Amino acid sequence: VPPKIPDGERVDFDDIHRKRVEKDLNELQTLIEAHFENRKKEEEELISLKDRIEKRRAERAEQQRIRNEREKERQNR
Amino acid sequence: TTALVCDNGSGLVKAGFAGDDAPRAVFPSIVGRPRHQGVMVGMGQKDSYVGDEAQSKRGILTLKYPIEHGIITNWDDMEKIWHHTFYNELRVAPEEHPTLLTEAPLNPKANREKMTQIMFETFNVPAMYVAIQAVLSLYASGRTTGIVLDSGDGVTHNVPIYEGYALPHAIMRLDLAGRDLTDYLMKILTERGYSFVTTAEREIVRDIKEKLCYVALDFENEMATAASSSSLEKSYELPDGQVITIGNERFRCPETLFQPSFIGMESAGIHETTYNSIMKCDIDIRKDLYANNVLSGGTTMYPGIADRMQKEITALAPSTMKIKIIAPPERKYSVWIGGSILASLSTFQQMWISKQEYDEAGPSIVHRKCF
Amino acid sequence: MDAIKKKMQMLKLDKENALDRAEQAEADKKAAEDRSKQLEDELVSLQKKLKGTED
Amino acid sequence: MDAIKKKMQMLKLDKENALDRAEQAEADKKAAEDRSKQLEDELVSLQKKLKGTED
Ligand SMILES: Nc1ncnc2c1ncn2[C@@H]1O[C@H](COP(=O)(O)OP(=O)(O)O)[C@@H](O)[C@H]1O
Numbered sequence: 083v084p085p086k087i088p089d090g091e092r093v094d095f096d097d098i099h100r101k102r103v104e105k106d107l108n109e110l111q112t113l114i115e116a117h118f119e120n121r122k123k124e125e126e127e128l129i130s131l132k133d134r135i136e137k138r139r140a141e142r143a144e145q146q147r148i149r150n151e152r153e154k155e156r157q158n159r
Numbered sequence: 160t161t162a163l164v165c166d167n168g169s170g171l172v173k174a175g176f177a178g179d180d181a182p183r184a185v186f187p188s189i190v191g192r193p194r195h196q197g198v199m200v201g202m203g204q205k206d207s208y209v210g211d212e213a214q215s216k217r218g219i220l221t222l223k224y225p226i227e228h229g230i231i232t233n234w235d236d237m238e239k240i241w242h243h244t245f246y247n248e249l250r251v252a253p254e255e256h257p258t259l260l261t262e263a264p265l266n267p268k269a270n271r272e273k274m275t276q277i278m279f280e281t282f283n284v285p286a287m288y289v290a291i292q293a294v295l296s297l298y299a300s301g302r303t304t305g306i307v308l309d310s311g312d313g314v315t316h317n318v319p320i321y322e323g324y325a326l327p328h329a330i331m332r333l334d335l336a337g338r339d340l341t342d343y344l345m346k347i348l349t350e351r352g353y354s355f356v357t358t359a360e361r362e363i364v365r366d367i368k369e370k371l372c373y374v375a376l377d378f379e380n381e382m383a384t385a386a387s388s389s390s391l392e393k394s395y396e397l398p399d400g401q402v403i404t405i406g407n408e409r410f411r412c413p414e415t416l417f418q419p420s421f422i423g424m425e426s427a428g429i430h431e432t433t434y435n436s437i438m439k440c441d442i443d444i445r446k447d448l449y450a451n452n453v454l455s456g457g458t459t460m461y462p463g464i465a466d467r468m469q470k471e472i473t474a475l476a477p478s479t480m481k482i483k484i485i486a487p488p489e490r491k492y493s494v495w496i497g498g499s500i501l502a503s504l505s506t507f508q509q510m511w512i513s514k515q516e517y518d519e520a521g522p523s524i525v526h527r528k529c530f
Numbered sequence: 531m532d533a534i535k536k537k538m539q540m541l542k543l544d545k546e547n548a549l550d551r552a553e554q555a556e557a558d559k560k561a562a563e564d565r566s567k568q569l570e571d572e573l574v575s576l577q578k579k580l581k582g583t584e585d
Numbered sequence: 586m587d588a589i590k591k592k593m594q595m596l597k598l599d600k601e602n603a604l605d606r607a608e609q610a611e612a613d614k615k616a617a618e619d620r621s622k623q624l625e626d627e628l629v630s631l632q633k634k635l636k637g638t639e640d
C-alpha cells in the first residue's frame with residue numbers, strides 16, 4: 083500500500099516571510115556596503131599608485147638617458 | 160544532530176546541511192580517468208579525478224557522467240562521487256548524520272534499492288530517506304497545491320499535486336532534458352564550421368548554451384528576423400581564442416523543448432505534456448492547477464521561457480481560466496531548498512528508515528511504508 | 531553588476547504582485563457588480579408580479 | 586548611466602499603476618456590495634408586502 087503520513091499540526095507558506103523578507107533588505111544593504119567599501123579601497127588607491135609608479139618610471143627614464151649619454155660620450159672613439 | 164540533504168541529480172551534485180538557504184558544495188558529477196601515457200615521474204598523478212577537479216584538468220581526461228537519465232548506470236563511479244561529496248566537500252563523516260537522497264519519479268526499483276544498500280553498508284549512515292524530486296520543489300515554493308515541471312539535466316518530469324495529495328496516475332515523465340539540448344546544440348553548431356567532438360568539448364558547448372541561448376517568444380518570427388538582419392549574432396571566446404559567432408542557433412537549441420521532433424523524439428513538448436498532465440486530473444481541481452503552475456530545475460532558466468510557456472498553455476487551455484507560471488529566481492536550487500525545509504520539519508523526524516529496520520527487512524524496505 | 535540585478539529582481543517582484551492584485555480586484559468588481567444587477571432585476575420582476583397581484 | 590534609470594522608473598510606474606487600479610476596483614466593489622445588501626433588504630420587505638397582498 084502507498085505510505086500513510088502521520089498527522090501533524092502546522093505550518094506552510096509561513097516560512098516564506100522569514101526566509102524572504104530577511105534577505106529582501108539585509109542582502110541589499112550588505113551588498114551596497116560591500117560595493118562601497120570595495121570601490122573606496124580599490125579605485126582611488128589604484129589610480130594614486132599608478133601615478134606614483136609613473137613618476138618613478140619617469141625618474142628611471144631620466145637616469146637611463148643620463149647614463150646612456152655619458153657612456154656614449156666617453157666610449158665614442 | 161543535523162541531517163545531510165544530498166541531491167544526486169544528473170549533471171550537478173548539490174549537497175549541504177539541513178536548515179540553510181543554499182547548498183554548501185555544488186560541483187559537476189563527472190569522473191574522468193586520464194587517457195594519455197604520462198612521462199613525468201613523481202608528479203603525484205591520481206587514477207581518477209572526480210568532481211570539480213576534473214573540470215580543470217579536462218584537457219587530458221575522458222569525463223564520463225555516472226548518471227544517464229535519472230537512473231545510475233555505473234555504480235562504482237557513483238560510489239566514488241558520494242565518497243568525495245561526503246569526505247572532501249563537506250568533511251563530515253557519514254557515521255553521524257542522516258541523509259536525504261532524491262530520486263526522479265518512475266525510476267527502476269533496483270536503482271533505489273542499490274542506493275539504499277550502498278548508503279547503509281558502505282558509508283554506514285544512521286538513517287536515510289528517499290524523496291521524489293518534485294515534492295521538494297513544491298515545498299520550496301511555500302505552496303501546497305500546484306503542478307510542478309522539474310526540467311532537470313537528465314529527465315523532465317511533471318508531477319501534479321493537490322492539497323498535499325499527489326495524483327500518481329497523472330505523472331508524465333519525459334526523457335528530454337539539458338543533456339539532449341547540449342548534444343543538439345553541438346550538432347547544429349557544425350552548420351557554421353565549428354566541430355566539437357571530444358567529451359571534454361561537450362563542456363565548452365554546455366557553457367555556450369548556458370551563456371548565449373534563449374527561448375524565443377514566437378519561433379517563426381525569430382527565424383525570419385535572424386535570416387534578414389544581424390542583430391542577434393552574439394560572439395563568444397573559446398578557451399583559447401578564435402571567437403565564434405552564433406546566429407539563429409541561439410533560440411533553435413532550446414526550442415527543442417517545445418518541439419521534440421527536432422531530435423527525432425515523437426512526444427509533445429513541455430508546453431503540451433503539462434496540459435495533458437492537467438487534463439488527466441479530476442474536473443474540480445483543474446482551476447487550481449492552472450493557477451499554480453510551478454517551474455523548477457536547471458533547464459528552466461532560459462531567458463524568456465516563463466512567457467513562452469504561458470502563451471502556449473493559454474492557447475491550449477479554456478479562455479476563462481487564469482494561467483499563472485511561478486518562476487522563482489532561485490530555480491536551480493529549488494529542489495535542494497525544499498529538501499532542507501523537509502528535513503528540518505519536526506513532523507518528518509520519525510519517517511527516516513532507521514538502520515535496525517533495514518537489518519530486519521533488507522534493502523526492499525524502501526518500497527514499504529517508509530517510502 | 532551584482533547588487534543592481536538583485537534590486538531589479540525586487541522591483542520585478544513588486545511588479546508581479548501589484549499587477550496580480552490589480553487584476554484580481556478587477557475580477558472581483560466585475561463579479562460583485564453582476565451580482566448586484568441580477569438582484570436588481572429580480573427586484574424589478576417582483577415589483578411587476580406585485581402589480582399583477584394588485585390588479 | 587542611462588538604462589538603470591529608465592528601467593527602474595518604468596517598473597516603479599508599473600507598480601504604482603497596478604496599485605491605484607486595484608484600489609479603485611476594491612472601492613467600487615465595496616460600494617456595489619453595500620448597494621446589493623440594500624437591494625436584498627428591500628426585496629425581502631417587497632416579498633412580505635406581496636404575500637400580504639396575496640392573502
Ligand atoms: N543559467 C542557465 N541557463 C541555461 N541552462 C542552464 C543554466 N544553468 C544550468 N543549465 C542547464 O541545466 C543543467 C543543470 O541542471 P540541474 O538542475 O543541475 O540538474 P539536476 O536536476 O541533475 O541537478 C546544466 O546541464 C545546464 O545544461
Ligand SMILES: [Mg+2]
Nearest residue numbers: 168311456494
Ligand atoms: Mg533536479
